């Protein structure tokens, strides 16, 4: 062993055949059961190069999650490439479960155990495994939810920091909990999210410090909201209990040197721009009754302005391959012998 290689991975999960939650249903027919006693072979003094930005695992995961969504969250109407696709659009139970990605016989997965690994180049503390850790396929913009935390300090990753067109992925080391609700009272499409103001402020400060560490210690770090675009990437958008939330993130991303809970106003939308492909999807009205999500903010997607002393950063996202990237960064598939 071994050699960096490409093969068709398979997925494993602890999905329950009796749960009608759609990730479970999908995973029940799509995945095999997890190993209760998973094995790890530590190669403590072996160095291996990684490139999270060129990782086929992401592409495969992307495919899988497209399949999952296309089977699980069926829109009443889909507008795509001159076609109108209509189908039964039941409101369903929707709550992501962890998915493990596994190398078939003849192959193994390399895991980087360097705790400050910037996602590209050499990794010195590597181990070999059959499967990745459980990755929750959360589809969102701006904020990464319910993901894995940095073990030590905050870590920021970019394919190329000096290139302002390349997305910056922030991995926090402390979760910031965000509670989003469509109150049942009314306006069934009116929702909101609450989170701790001071935790968020300190999170921004620590991210700012880490950004200066990268772009220069004399540089003033500023956060501004999105410059514009589709509602999905201008707002913090996500799916909570099968409903599509669009939350105004101005209060999250307006910050410079200069209440208790931050309350973000949100709308539940029925007519969505799709992440899987270019077009629209139209869903049935919000369910009455409880719509409620509590999530760990565990990461961020940022873009940098670029172009005199000051650096402005804005919330980004849109390419979900980055979301998968935020979790698969420490992995690569290899062939044994």
């Amino acid at each position, epitope marked *: 062993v071994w050699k960096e290689a490409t093969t068709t991975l398979f997925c494993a999960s602890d999905a329950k055949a009796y749960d009608t939650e759609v990730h479970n249903v999908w995973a029940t027919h799509a995945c095999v059961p997890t190993d209760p006693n998973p094995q790890e072979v530590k190669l403590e003094n072996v160095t291996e190069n990684f490139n999270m930005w060129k990782n086929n695992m992401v592409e495969q995961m992307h495919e899988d999650i497209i399949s999952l969504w296309d089977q699980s969250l069926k829109p009443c109407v889909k507008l795509t490439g001159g076609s109108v696709i209509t189908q039964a659009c039941p409101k369903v139970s929707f709550e992501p479960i962890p998915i493990h990605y596994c190398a078939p016989a003849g192959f193994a997965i390399l895991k980087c155990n360097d705790k400050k690994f910037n996602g590209t180049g050499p990794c010195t503390n590597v181990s070999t495994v059959q499967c990745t850790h459980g990755i929750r396929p959360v589809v969102s913009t701006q904020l990464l939810l319910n993901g894995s935390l940095a073990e030590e300090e905050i870590v920021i990753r970019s394919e190329n920091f000096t290139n302002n067109a390349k997305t910056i992925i922030v991995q926090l080391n402390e979760s910031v909990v965000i509670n989003c609700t469509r109150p049942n009272n009314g306006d069934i*499409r*009116q929702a909101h999210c609450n989170l701790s103001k001071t935790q968020w402020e300190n999170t921004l400060e620590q991210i700012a410090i880490k950004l200066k560490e990268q772009f220069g210690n004399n540089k003033t770090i500023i956060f501004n909201p999105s410059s514009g675009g589709d*509602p999905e990437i201008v707002t913090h958008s996500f799916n909570c209990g099968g409903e599509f939330f669009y939350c105004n993130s101005t209060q999250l991303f307006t910050w410079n040197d200069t209440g208790r809970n931050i309350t973000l106003p949100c709308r539940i939308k*029925q*007519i969505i721009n799709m992440w899987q492909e270019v077009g629209k999807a139209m869903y049935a009205p919000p369910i009455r009754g409880q719509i409620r999500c509590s999530s760990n903010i565990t990461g961020l997607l940022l873009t940098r302005d670029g172009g005199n002393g000051t650096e402005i950063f804005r919330p980004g996202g849109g390419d979900m391959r980055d979301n998968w990237r935020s979790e698969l960064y420490k992995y690569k598939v290899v062939k044994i012998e």
Partner: nanobody
Amino acid sequence: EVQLVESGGGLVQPGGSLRLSCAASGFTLDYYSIGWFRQAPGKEREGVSCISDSDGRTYYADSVKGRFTISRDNAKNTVYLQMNSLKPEDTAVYYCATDCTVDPSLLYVMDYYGKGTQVTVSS
């Protein structure tokens, strides 16, 4: 194809009235929030009015409350906005929109809308 056919509007003296209509092909309006928002050139979006669901729940921007009335004809799949007691600051382009909202902090979530109907209020 899905589309929104707007009509009505124009020019009136302050305190006059207009009626806007938006006819939707492609939906059943009572399955959506449908309504109007407005924008004047060089100015930010402003909320106006939304109608919603089977019982036709209605929502109004504070600035138009009591003056504007939104209603729905299910058979014609059409929504109407009766604009009374018009004031000069009501001058704007009114856009009929799906996923309609009147919340001042969420007006730019509306990206699926039916292009201008101009309303101008002047003496």
